[PDB]
Structure formats: C-alpha cells, structure tokens
Coordinates of N, CA and C and ligand atoms in Angstrom, one line a residue:
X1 N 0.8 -1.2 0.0 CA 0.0 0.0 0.0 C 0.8 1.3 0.0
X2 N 0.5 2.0 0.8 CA 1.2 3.5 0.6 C 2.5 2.9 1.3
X3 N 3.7 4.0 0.8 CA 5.1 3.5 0.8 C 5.8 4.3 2.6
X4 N 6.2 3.6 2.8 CA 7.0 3.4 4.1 C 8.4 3.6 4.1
X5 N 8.9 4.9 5.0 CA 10.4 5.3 4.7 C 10.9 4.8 6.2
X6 N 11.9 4.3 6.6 CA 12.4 3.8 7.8 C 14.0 4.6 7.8
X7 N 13.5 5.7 8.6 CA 14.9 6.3 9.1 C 15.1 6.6 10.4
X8 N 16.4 6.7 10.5 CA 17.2 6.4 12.1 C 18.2 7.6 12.0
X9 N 18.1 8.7 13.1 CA 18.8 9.6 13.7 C 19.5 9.1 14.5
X10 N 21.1 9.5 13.9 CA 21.9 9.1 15.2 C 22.9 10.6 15.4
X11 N 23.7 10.4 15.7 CA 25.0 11.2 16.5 C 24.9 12.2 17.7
X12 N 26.0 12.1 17.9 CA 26.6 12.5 19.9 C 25.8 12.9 20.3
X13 N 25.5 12.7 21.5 CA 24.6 13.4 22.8 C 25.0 14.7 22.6
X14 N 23.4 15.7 22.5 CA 23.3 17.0 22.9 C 23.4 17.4 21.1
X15 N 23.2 16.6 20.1 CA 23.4 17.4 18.6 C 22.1 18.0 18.2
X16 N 21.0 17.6 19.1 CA 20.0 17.8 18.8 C 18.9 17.2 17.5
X17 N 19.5 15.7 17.9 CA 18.4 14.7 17.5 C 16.7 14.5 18.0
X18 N 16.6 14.9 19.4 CA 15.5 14.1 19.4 C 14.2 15.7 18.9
X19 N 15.7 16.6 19.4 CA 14.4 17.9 18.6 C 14.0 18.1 17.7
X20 N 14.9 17.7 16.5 CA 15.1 17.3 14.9 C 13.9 16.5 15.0
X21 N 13.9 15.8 15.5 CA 13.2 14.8 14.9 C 11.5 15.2 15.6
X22 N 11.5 15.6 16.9 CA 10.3 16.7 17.6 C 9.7 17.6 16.5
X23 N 10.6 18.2 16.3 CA 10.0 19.3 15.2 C 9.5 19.3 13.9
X24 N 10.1 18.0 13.5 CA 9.3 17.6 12.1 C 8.0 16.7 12.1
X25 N 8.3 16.2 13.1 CA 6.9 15.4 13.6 C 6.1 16.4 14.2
X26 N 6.2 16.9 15.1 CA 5.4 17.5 15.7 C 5.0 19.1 15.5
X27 N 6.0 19.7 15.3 CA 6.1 21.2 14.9 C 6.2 21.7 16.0
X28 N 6.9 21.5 17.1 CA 7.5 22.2 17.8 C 8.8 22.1 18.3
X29 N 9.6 23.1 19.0 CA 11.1 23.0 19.5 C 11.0 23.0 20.8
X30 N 11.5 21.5 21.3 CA 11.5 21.0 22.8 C 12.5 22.0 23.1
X31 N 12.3 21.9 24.8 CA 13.6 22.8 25.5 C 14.2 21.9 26.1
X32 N 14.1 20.5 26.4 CA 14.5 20.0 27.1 C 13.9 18.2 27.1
X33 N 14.7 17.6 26.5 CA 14.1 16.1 26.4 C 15.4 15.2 26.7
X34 N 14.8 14.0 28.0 CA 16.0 13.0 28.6 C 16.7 12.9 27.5
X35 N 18.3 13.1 27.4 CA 18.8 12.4 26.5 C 19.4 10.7 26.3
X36 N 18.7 10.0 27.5 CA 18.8 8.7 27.2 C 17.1 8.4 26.5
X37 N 16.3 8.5 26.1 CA 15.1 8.1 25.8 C 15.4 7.8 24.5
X38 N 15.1 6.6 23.8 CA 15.3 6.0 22.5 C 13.7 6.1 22.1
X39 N 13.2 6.9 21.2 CA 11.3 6.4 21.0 C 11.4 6.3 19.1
X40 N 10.3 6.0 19.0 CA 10.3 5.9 16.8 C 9.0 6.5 17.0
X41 N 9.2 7.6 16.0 CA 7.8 8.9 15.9 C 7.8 8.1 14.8
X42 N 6.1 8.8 14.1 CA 5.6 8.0 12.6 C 4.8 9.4 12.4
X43 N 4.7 10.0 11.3 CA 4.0 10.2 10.7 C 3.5 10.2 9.1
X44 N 2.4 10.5 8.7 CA 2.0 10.3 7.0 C 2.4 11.5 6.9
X45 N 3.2 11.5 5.7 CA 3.2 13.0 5.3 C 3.1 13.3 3.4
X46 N 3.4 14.4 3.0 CA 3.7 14.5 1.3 C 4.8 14.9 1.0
X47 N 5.7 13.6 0.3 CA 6.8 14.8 0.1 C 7.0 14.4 -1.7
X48 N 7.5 15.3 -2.2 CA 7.2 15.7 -3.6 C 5.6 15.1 -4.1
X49 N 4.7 15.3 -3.6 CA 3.3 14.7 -4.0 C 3.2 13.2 -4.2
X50 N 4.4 12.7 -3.2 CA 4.2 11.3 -2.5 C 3.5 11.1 -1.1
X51 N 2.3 10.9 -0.6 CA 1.8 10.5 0.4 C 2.6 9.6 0.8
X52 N 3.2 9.2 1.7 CA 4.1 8.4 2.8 C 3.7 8.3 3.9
X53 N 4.4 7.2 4.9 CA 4.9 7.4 6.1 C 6.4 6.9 6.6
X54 N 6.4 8.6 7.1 CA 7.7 8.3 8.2 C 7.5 7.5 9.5
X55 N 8.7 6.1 9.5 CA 8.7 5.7 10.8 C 10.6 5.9 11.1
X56 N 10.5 7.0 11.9 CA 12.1 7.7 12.0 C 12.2 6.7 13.5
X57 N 13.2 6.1 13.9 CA 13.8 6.3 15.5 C 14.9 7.0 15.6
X58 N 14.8 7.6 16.7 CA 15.6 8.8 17.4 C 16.3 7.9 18.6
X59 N 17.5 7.3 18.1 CA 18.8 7.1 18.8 C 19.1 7.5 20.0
X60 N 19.2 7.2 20.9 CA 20.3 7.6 22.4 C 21.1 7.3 22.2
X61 N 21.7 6.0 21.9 CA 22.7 5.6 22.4 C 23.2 4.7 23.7
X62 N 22.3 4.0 24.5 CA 21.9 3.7 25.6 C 22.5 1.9 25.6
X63 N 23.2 1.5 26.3 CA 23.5 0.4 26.3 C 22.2 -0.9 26.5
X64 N 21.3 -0.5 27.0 CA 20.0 -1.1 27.2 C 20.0 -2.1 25.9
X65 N 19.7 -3.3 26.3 CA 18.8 -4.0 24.5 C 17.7 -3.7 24.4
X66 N 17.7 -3.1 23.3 CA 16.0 -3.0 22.8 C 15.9 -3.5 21.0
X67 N 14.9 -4.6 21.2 CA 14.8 -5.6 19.9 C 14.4 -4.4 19.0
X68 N 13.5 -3.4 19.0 CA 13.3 -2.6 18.2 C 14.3 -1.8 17.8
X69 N 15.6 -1.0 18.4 CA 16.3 -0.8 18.2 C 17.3 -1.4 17.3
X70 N 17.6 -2.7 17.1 CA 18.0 -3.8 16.2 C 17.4 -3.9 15.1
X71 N 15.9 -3.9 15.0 CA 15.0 -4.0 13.7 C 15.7 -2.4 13.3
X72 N 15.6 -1.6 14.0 CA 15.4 -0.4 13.0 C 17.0 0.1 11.6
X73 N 17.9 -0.7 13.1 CA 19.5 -1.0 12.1 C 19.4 -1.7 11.1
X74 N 19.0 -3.0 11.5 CA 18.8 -4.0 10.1 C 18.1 -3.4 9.2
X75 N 17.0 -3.3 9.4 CA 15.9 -2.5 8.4 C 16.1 -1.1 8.4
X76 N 16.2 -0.5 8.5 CA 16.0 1.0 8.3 C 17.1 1.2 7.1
X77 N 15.9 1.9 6.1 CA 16.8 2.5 5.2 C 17.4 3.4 5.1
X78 N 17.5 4.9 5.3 CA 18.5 6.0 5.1 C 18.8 6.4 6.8
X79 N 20.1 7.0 7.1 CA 20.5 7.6 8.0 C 20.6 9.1 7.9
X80 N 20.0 9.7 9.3 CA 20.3 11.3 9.7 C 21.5 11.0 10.3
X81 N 23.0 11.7 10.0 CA 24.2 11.6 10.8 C 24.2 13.2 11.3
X82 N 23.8 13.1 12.3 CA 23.9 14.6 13.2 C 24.8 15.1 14.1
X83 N 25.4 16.5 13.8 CA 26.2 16.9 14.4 C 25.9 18.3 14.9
X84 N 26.2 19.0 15.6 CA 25.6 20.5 16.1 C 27.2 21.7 15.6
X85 N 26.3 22.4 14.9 CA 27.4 23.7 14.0 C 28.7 24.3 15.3
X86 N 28.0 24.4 16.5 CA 28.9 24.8 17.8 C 29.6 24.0 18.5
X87 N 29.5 22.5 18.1 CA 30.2 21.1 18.9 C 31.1 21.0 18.0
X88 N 32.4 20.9 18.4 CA 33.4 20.4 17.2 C 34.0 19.2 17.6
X89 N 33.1 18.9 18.5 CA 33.8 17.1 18.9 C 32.8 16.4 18.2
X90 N 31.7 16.8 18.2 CA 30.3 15.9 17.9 C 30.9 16.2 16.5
X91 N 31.2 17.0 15.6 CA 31.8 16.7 14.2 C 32.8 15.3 14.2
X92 N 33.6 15.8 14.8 CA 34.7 14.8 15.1 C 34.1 13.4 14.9
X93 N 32.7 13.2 16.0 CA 32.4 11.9 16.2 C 31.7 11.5 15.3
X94 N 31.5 12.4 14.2 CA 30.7 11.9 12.4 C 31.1 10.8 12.5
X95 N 32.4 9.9 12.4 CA 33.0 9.1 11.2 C 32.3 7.6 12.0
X96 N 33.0 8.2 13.4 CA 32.5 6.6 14.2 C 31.2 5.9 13.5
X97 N 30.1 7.3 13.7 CA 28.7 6.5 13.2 C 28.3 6.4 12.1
X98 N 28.9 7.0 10.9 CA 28.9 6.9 9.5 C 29.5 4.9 9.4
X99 N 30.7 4.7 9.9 CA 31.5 3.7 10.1 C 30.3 2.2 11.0
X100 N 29.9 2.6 11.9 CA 28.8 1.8 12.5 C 28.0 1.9 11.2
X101 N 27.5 2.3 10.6 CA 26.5 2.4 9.8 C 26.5 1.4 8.7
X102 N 27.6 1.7 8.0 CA 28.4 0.6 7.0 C 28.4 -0.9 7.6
X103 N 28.5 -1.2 9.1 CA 28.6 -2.3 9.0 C 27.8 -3.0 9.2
X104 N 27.0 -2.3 10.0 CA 25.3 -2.6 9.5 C 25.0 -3.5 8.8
X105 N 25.2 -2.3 7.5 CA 24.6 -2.5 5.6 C 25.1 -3.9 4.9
X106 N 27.2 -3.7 6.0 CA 27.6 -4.2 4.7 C 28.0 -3.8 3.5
X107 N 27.9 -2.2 3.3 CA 27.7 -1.8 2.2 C 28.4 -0.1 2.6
X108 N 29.3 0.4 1.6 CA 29.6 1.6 1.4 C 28.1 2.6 0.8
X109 N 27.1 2.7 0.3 CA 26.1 2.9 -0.5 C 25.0 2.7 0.4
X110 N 25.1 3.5 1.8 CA 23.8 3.7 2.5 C 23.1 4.7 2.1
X111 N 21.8 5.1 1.8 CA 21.0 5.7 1.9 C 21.7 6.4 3.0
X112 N 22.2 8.3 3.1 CA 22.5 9.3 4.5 C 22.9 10.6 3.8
X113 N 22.2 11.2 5.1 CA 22.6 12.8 4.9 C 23.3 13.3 5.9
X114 N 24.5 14.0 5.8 CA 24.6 14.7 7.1 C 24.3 16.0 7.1
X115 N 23.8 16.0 8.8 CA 23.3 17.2 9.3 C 24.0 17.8 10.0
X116 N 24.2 19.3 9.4 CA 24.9 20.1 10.9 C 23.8 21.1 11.4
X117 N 23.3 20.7 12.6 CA 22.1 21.6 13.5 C 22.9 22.5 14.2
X118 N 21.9 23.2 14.9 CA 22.1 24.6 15.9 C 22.3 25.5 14.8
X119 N 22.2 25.5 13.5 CA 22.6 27.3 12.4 C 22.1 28.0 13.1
X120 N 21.4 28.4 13.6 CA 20.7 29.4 14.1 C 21.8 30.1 15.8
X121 N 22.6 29.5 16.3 CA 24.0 29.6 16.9 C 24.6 30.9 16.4
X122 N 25.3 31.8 16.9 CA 26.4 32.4 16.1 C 27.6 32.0 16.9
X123 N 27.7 31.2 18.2 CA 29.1 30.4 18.4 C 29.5 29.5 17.1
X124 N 28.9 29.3 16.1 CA 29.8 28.1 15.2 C 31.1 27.8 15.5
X125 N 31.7 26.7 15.7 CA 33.0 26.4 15.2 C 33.5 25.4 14.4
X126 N 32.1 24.6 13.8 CA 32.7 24.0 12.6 C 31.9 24.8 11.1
X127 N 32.9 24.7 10.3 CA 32.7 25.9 9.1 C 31.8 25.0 7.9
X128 N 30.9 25.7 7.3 CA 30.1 24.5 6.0 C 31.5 24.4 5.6
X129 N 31.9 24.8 4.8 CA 33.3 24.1 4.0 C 34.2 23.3 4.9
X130 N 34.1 22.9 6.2 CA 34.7 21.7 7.0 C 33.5 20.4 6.5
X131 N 32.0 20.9 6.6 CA 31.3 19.6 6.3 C 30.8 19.3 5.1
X132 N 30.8 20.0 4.6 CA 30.6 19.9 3.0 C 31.7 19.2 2.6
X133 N 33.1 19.4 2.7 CA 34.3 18.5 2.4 C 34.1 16.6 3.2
X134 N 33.8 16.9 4.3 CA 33.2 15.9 4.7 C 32.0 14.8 4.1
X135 N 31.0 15.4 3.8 CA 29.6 15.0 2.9 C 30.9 14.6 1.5
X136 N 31.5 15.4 0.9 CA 32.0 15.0 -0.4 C 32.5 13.6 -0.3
X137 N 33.4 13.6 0.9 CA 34.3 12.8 0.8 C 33.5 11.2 1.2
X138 N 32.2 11.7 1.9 CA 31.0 10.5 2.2 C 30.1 10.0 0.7
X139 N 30.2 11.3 -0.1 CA 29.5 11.1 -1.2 C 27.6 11.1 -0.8
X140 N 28.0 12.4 0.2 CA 26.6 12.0 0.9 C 25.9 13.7 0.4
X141 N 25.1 13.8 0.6 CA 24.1 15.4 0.8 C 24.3 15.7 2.0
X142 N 24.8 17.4 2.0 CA 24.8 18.0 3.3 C 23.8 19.4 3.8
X143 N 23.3 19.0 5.3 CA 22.2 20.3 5.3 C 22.4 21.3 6.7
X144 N 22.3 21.8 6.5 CA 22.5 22.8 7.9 C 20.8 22.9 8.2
X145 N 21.0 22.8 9.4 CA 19.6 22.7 10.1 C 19.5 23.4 11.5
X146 N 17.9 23.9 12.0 CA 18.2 24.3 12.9 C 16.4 24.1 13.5
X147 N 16.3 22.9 14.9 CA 15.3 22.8 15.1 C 14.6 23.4 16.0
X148 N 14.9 24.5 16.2 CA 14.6 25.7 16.7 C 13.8 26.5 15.6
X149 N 14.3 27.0 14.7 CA 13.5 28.0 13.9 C 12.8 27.0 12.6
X150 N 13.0 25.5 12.3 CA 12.6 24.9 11.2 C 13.5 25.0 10.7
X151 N 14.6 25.7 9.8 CA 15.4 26.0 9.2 C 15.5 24.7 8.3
X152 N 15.7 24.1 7.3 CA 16.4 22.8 6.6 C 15.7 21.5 7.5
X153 N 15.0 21.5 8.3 CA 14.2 20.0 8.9 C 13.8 19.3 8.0
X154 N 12.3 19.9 7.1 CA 12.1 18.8 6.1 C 12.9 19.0 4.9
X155 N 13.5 19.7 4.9 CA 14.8 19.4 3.8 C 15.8 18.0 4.5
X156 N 16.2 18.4 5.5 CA 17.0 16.8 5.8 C 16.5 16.0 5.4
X157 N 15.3 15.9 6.1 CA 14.5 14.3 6.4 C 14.0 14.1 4.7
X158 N 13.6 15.2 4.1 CA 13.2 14.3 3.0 C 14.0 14.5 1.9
X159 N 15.0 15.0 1.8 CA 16.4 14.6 1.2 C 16.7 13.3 1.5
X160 N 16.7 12.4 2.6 CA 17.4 11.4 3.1 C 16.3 10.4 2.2
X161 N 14.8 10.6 2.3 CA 13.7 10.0 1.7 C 14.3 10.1 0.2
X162 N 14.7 11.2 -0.9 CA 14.5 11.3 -1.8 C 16.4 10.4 -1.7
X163 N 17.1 9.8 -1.1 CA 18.5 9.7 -1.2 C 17.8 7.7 -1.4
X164 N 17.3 7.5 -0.5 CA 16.3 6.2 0.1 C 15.4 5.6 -1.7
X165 N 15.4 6.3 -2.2 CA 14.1 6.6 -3.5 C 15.5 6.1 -4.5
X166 N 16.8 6.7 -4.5 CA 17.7 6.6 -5.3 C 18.0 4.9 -5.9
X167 N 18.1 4.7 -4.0 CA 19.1 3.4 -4.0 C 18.1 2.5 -4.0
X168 N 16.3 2.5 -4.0 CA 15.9 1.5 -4.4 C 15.9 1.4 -6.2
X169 N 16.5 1.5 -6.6 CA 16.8 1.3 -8.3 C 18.4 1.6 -8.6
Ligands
LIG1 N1 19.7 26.7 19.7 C1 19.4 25.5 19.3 N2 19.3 24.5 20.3 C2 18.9 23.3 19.9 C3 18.7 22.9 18.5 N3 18.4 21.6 18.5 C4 18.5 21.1 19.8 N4 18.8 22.1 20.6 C5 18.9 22.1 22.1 O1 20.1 21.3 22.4 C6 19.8 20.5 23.6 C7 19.9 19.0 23.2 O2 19.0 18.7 22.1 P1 18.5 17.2 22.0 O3 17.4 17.0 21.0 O4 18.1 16.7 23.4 O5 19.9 16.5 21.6 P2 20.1 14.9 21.5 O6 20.9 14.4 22.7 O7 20.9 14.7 20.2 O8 18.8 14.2 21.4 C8 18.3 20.8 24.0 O9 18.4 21.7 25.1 C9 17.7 21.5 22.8 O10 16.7 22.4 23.1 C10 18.9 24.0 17.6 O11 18.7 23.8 16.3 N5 19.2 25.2 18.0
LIG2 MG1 17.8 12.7 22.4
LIG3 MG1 6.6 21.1 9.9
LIG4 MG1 38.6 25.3 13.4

C-alpha cells in the first residue's frame, strides 16, 4: 500500500536529535528532552506529492537491548548523521557513526545525509566548507539545520527519503 520510509537519527549526545526529529513530527522545538530516551515517531506526510509514512527512530545511544532498536539497524533504510554547528567534537564523532553504519549494511552505499544543527547559533565552530568536504568525501548530501526556527528540517529528512528513492533502483 502507501510507501513506508524507515529512518534512524543518530549522533553524539546534545546534537540535537531528538528535537530534529520533535520538530518535524510535531512542529515544535523541545527545550528539554532526557537524553537517554530512544522512541520511533511515525507520521504520514507528502513529500514531492508522494503520500508516505515516516517511521524515524531517534537514537540515544543507551546500552539497554531494545529488539526494536536492532530492527530499525537492520531495516531501516537512510540515515540522519547529526552533528551540532557549535560542537566540534560531535563533528569529530561523524565518522565513528557513518562507520557503524556501514557495517550494519555491509555496504559503502547507505542511503545518508549529514546534518549540521544549531545554524541558528552564532558560536559556530565547525565551518560548512569543513562539512561539505566531509559530505564529499562521504559522497553523501549535506544540510544545515536548525530545530529551533525549522530552518532545513524537512529538507534533511526528505532529502534522506529522496536519497532512500535513489538506492531503491
Ligand atoms: N539553539 C538550538 N538549540 C537546539 C537545537 N536543537 C536542539 N537544541 C537544544 O540542544 C539540547 C539538546 O538537544 P537534544 O534534541 O536533546 O539532543 P540529542 O541528545 O541529540 O537528542 C536541547 O536543550 C535542545 O533544546 C537547535 O537547532 N538550536
Ligand atoms: Mg535525544
Ligand atoms: Mg513542519
Ligand atoms: Mg577550526
């Protein structure tokens, strides 16, 4: 029936995943959400005058087993790799989870976008031309985002859908 996108938000505590993912689903910017809480928001939405649904999970990171956490690796098709424009460690820690990602798949050729959140910051200290060289060298799409004002949200997420759309053919 109607087509089903399975994407998974990951990177470092505090990059502003689970707002990212709050704000597209819900349309608002949390101030404050546990950062150990792993949940999968769903909604139907249109993107290029495709009716869908998004079933995203939003990552912690949490040593806990959770079987659904396992389905959503195995299965899930494209990856959000998120980093925050003002964290220059959480840059740093791109590769680990681009790297987990791959071995996942199995495959160099994941469906992923990376995101650099907080634009809306004027602390930056990683520069687009630091992550765009990055994204190149991933061969990936890159978005500056900011889930605070909306900025690039449904550009990420449905970039990563229209990235997902690629690699089924
Ligand atoms: N200024 C600003 N703050 C943000 C943005 N995204 C998230 N935050 C804040 O950064 C903190 C961590 O965000 P959170 O979604 O919990 O990060 P997570 O650990 O990756 O899930 C929270 O206090 C958010 O309100 C953003 O785009 N701009
Ligand atoms: Mg979180
Ligand atoms: Mg919206
Ligand atoms: Mg520098």
């Amino acid at each position: 029936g109607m087509t089903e996108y399975k994407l998974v938000v990951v990177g470092a505590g505090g990059v502003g995943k689970s707002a990212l993912t709050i704000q597209l689903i819900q349309n608002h910017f949390v101030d404050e959400y546990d950062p150990t809480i792993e949940d999968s928001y769903r909604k139907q939405v249109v993107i290029d005058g495709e009716t869908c649904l998004l079933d995203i999970l939003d990552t912690a990171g949490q040593e806990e087993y959770s079987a659904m956490r396992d389905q959503y690796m195995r299965t899930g098709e494209g990856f959000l790799c998120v980093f925050a424009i003002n964290n220059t460690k959480s840059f740093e820690d791109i590769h680990h989870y681009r790297e987990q990602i791959k071995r996942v798949k199995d495959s160099e050729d994941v469906p992923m976008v990376l995101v650099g959140n907080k634009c809306d910051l004027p602390s930056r200290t990683v520069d687009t031309k630091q992550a765009q060289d990055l994204a190149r060298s991933y061969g990936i799409p890159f978005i500056e985002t900011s889930a605070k004002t909306r900025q690039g949200v449904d550009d990420a997420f449905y970039t990563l859908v229209r990235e997902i759309r690629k690699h089924k053919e």
